[PDB]
């Protein structure tokens, strides 16, 4: 209840929001049904329109008038946008000559250049190309300023859980709004879009940048704009606060516009229709800059054009229906569209199985558009498992399709023709990211970013210091002129150590067989060299890993690799190898088929054994270093140590075979060489961070060996290709990935072909960024390098997409 009573004489868009049941005059007041009777009459005004006219120049300050052309208006801070252009001979700020802001340029008593940040809905990256001869001020932001070619959101490609990421740092399933539309099953509660519950703080995890602000002395705007409240009336309320005084005036500000997504959703991303979109956006912007411009506050501003998705083709036609697979189609609940999540209609029903609902959802139609998966078995680079709110049954949607539960559900609900929502990956996905102000560089592009790497920078560009959060800070220095957050290596917590030849063959009793009884002092103390480290050099390019958590392992050294042996999980944590462009691949001969040898170094208490895996009909065995790419004959029998060793399921061993005897050698000559480096990863509830023992949940039958959930390989090389992986003098060029290491090959539909057809396919979907790595082994990856640590912190988020342009 609302005593709507009171009044917002004087209390026009106040920043403190006042107790029910007392009137608000807040812009929330709107979207809670709480304004005071006299909101629209003083707050909402719109008499006259947004522009100064020549005849309007000088004016009698009349209060009705949405804006002022008044001699007073400068200093009452209520000026319509282009006042000094119409009434002063002032230029529009976009038909200025950009000039380098070397230092912020602010009005007395501006403690700090204050943040603006732009917010664009469904504003797709390729809009700044395709559209740029009708967003002249876009335009000059854009070329002025700093600037992405494009900015990748977070999975799923929603508004809600892509700006809430914006503010928070976090992926989805931390900070909770893992849709536009969510179940919390611990609540039992359901969040929509549409109406009340969603306001409810319950659902917003995480610690969002105007809270941090407020937290540390940093007064905010509001970020969230009632949808009845003009463009036009945004901007004019944020230039006032702008005006207020220094105790009063907030440091961080937020607009938004629904544009360009609402008109995308109804012509498709490029219709005809989306020019206007457009041309209004650009005007938009051009009524700040004037207003900041005017306020002389447009070289002091530093202003964040951003997206939050793209948009896509998507019609009525192309929807799949989960009735034309399933028979109990009415048992379920569909969350459907450009995503599928799947749960029981009824938990009273114990006759529902995940599994059956899968099987008859995979691979069932030759040119199926939706795929299936348990949330643990999305790729991982989505980061879309570890909260409740997710459904364990997902369906990722092909571009361009929808999913749907039944027909009836599309023709009672052709309207639209766009949609967004898939996989981050996908390009037309991708949104926008333009920084400009005097903490910005000058006429700089940057490389693609992910947007959850935004709050620190927000943070820094605030004096603020980030909560915890999900970007890496400093992975985006090299977007800022000043600011930058000076960021040091994590401490090695862990140190090897370096066992030499401790333990007679006699002593080991692992059920293995090698026929390798076959016999030099030149040669001999040779060989003593690589076992101490002599080609290390050639192996391990960037240092060895830092083991970030408490534990006990092993380096050992080869001729050809180097490992960090885990004597708790019984492999190695880490392999590195190095493949030149002239390396060449050979068999496994005859005689080595099932040759696994004793390592002399590590105790018999502490490796593999032969027998566990032949007990094991599920469970076969396959090698970090690959035997194929050996140096020499002499050299194979090293890649078949029992150290080398680890668990894969034979339809996992096709995979991880092809990749090893044919992938690798195709990147070196690509890449002219590269180093390897590979292991496994124990993820058994899918929290995205390295499993400790205790929490592992599956075992090579009989024994101590842990079963990984994946296998990842970091694939490095020379950014300039004209010099050698092993002796690149400038930067590194990487691309990673972490498989899901699965019993059956169910993922990909055409796997009773050959390998050539679908495992390099399969890789792609995996594609990973080394962060996820290094979060999943709590290994630091790149410690001695020639590189800036900065630059290094780039690298460590690069992904690799595969996408074409
Ligand atoms: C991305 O970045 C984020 C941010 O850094 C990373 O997330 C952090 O990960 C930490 C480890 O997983 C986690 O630490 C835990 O904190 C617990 C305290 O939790 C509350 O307080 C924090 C801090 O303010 C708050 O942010 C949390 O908010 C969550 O929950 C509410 C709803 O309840 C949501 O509003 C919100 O969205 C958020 O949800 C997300 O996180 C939770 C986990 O907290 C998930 O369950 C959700 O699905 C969702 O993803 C919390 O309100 C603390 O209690 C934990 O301590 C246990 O473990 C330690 C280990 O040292 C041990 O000492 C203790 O014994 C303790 O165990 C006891 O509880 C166990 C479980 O009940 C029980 O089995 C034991 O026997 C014991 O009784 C733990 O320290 C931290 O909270 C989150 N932070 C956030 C914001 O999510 C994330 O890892 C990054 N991702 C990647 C891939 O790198
Ligand atoms: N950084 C950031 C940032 C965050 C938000 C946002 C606001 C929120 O306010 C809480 C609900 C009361 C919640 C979550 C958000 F992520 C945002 O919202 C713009 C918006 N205004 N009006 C809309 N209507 C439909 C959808 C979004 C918005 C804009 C930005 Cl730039
Ligand atoms: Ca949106
Ligand atoms: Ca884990
Ligand atoms: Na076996
Ligand atoms: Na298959
Ligand atoms: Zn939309």
Same mark, same amino acid.
């Given at each position: ?672 060489? +590269?180093?390897?480096?590979?292991? =496994?990863?124990?993820?058994? @509830? ?6 400790? &023992? #205790? !929490?592992? $949940? ?35 060029? +990487?691309?990673?990935?972490?498989? =899901?290491?699965?019993?059956? @090959? ?6 009773? &072909? #050959? !390998?050539? $057809? ?48």
């Amino acid at each position: 209840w609302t005593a709507t009573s009171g009044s917002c004489k004087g209390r026009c868009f106040e920043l403190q929001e006042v107790g029910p049941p007392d009137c608000r005059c807040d812009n929330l007041c709107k979207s809670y049904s709480s304004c005071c009777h006299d909101f629209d009459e003083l707050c909402l005004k719109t008499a006259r329109g947004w522009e100064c006219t020549k005849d309007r120049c000088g004016e009698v300050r009349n209060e009705e008038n949405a804006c002022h052309c008044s001699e007073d208006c400068l200093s009452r801070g209520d000026c319509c946008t282009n006042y000094q252009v119409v009434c002063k001979g002032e230029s529009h700020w976009v038909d200025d000559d950009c000039e380098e802001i070397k230092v912020p340029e602010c009005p007395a008593g501006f403690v700090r250049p204050p943040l603006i940040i732009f917010s664009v809905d469904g504003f797709r990256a390729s809009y700044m190309k395709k559209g740029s001869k009708v967003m002249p001020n876009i335009e000059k932001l854009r070329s002025c300023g700093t600037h992405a070619p494009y900015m990748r959101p977070v999975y799923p490609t929603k508004t809600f859980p892509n700006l809430y990421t914006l503010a928070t740092g976090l992926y989805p399933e931390s900070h909770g709004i893992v849709g536009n539309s969510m179940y919390d099953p611990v609540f039992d509660a359901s969040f929509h879009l549409r109406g009340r519950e969603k306001f409810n703080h319950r659902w917003w995890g995480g610690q969002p940048l105007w809270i941090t602000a407020t937290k540390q002395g940093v007064r905010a705007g509001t970020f969230f704009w009632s949808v009845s409240i003009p463009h036009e009336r945004r901007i004019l309320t944020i230039l006032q606060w702008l005006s207020l005084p220094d105790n009063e005036r907030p440091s961080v500000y937020a607009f938004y516009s629904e544009q360009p997504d609402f008109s995308g959703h109804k012509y498709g991303p490029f219709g005809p229709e989306m020019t206007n979109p457009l041309r209004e956006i650009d005007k938009t912007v051009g009524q700040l800059m004037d207003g900041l411009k005017q306020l002389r506050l447009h070289r002091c501003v530093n202003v964040i054009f951003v997206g939050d998705h793209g948009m896509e083709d998507v019609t009525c036609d192309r929807t799949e229906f989960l009735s034309n697979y399933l028979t109990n189609v009415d048992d379920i609940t569909l969350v459907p569209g450009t995503l599928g999540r799947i749960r029981a209609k009824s938990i009273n029903n114990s006759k529902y199985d995940p599994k059956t609902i899968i099987a008859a959802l995979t691979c069932k139609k030759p040119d199926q558009h939706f795929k299936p998966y348990m949330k643990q078995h999305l790729p991982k680079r989505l980061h879309y498992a570890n909260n409740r709110r997710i459904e364990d049954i997902h369906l990722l949607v092909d571009r361009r399709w929808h999913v749907a539960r039944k027909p009836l559900d599309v023709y009672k609900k052709c309207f639209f023709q766009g949609d967004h929502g898939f996989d981050n990956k996908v390009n037309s996905m991708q949104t926008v990211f333009v920084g400009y102000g005097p903490t910005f560089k000058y006429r700089t592009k940057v490389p693609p970013f992910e947007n959850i790497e935004l709050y620190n920078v927000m943070c820094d560009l605030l004096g603020l210091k980030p909560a915890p959060n999900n970007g890496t800070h400093g992975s985006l220095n090299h977007l800022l002129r000043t600011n930058t957050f000076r960021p040091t290596m994590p401490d090695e917590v862990s140190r090897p150590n370096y066992p030499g030849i401790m333990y007679l063959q006699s002593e080991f009793d692992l059920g293995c067989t090698c026929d390798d009884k076959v016999e030099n002092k030149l040669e001999e103390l040779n060989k003593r060299l690589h076992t101490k480290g002599s080609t290390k050099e050639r192996h391990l390019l960037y240092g060895r890993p830092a083991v970030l958590y408490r534990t006990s392992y092993d380096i050992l050294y080869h001729t050809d690799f180097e490992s960090g042996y885990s004597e708790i999980f019984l492999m190695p944590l880490w392999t590195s190898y190095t493949i030149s462009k002239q390396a060449e691949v050979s068999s496994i001969p005859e005689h080595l088929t099932n040759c696994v040898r004793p390592d002399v170094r590590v105790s018999p208490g502490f490796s593999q054994n032969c027998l566990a895996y032949k007990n094991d009909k599920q469970m076969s065995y396959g090698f970090l270093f690959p035997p194929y790419l050996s140096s020499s004959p002499e050299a194979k029998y090293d890649a078949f140590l029992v150290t080398n060793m680890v668990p894969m399921y034979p339809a996992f061993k096709r995979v991880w075979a092809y990749f090893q005897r044919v992938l690798v050698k195709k990147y070196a000559s690509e890449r002219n060489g +590269v180093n390897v480096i590979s292991g =496994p990863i124990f993820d058994y @509830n899918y929290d995205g961070l390295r499993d400790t &023992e #205790d !929490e592992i $949940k599956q075992y090579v039958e009989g024994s101590s060996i842990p079963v990984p959930t994946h296998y990842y390989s970091i694939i490095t090389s020379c950014l300039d290709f004209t010099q050698p992986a092993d002796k690149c003098d400038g930067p590194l060029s +990487v691309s990673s990935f972490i498989l =899901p290491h699965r019993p059956d @090959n169910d993922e990909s539909c055409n796997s009773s &072909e #050959d !390998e050539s $057809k679908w495992v390099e396919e399969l890789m792609k979907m995996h594609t990973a960024r080394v962060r996820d790595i290094e979060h999943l082994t709590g290994l630091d990856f790149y410690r001695k390098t020639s590189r800036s640590y900065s630059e290094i912190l780039t690298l460590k988020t690069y992904l690799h997409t595969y996408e074409s342009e």
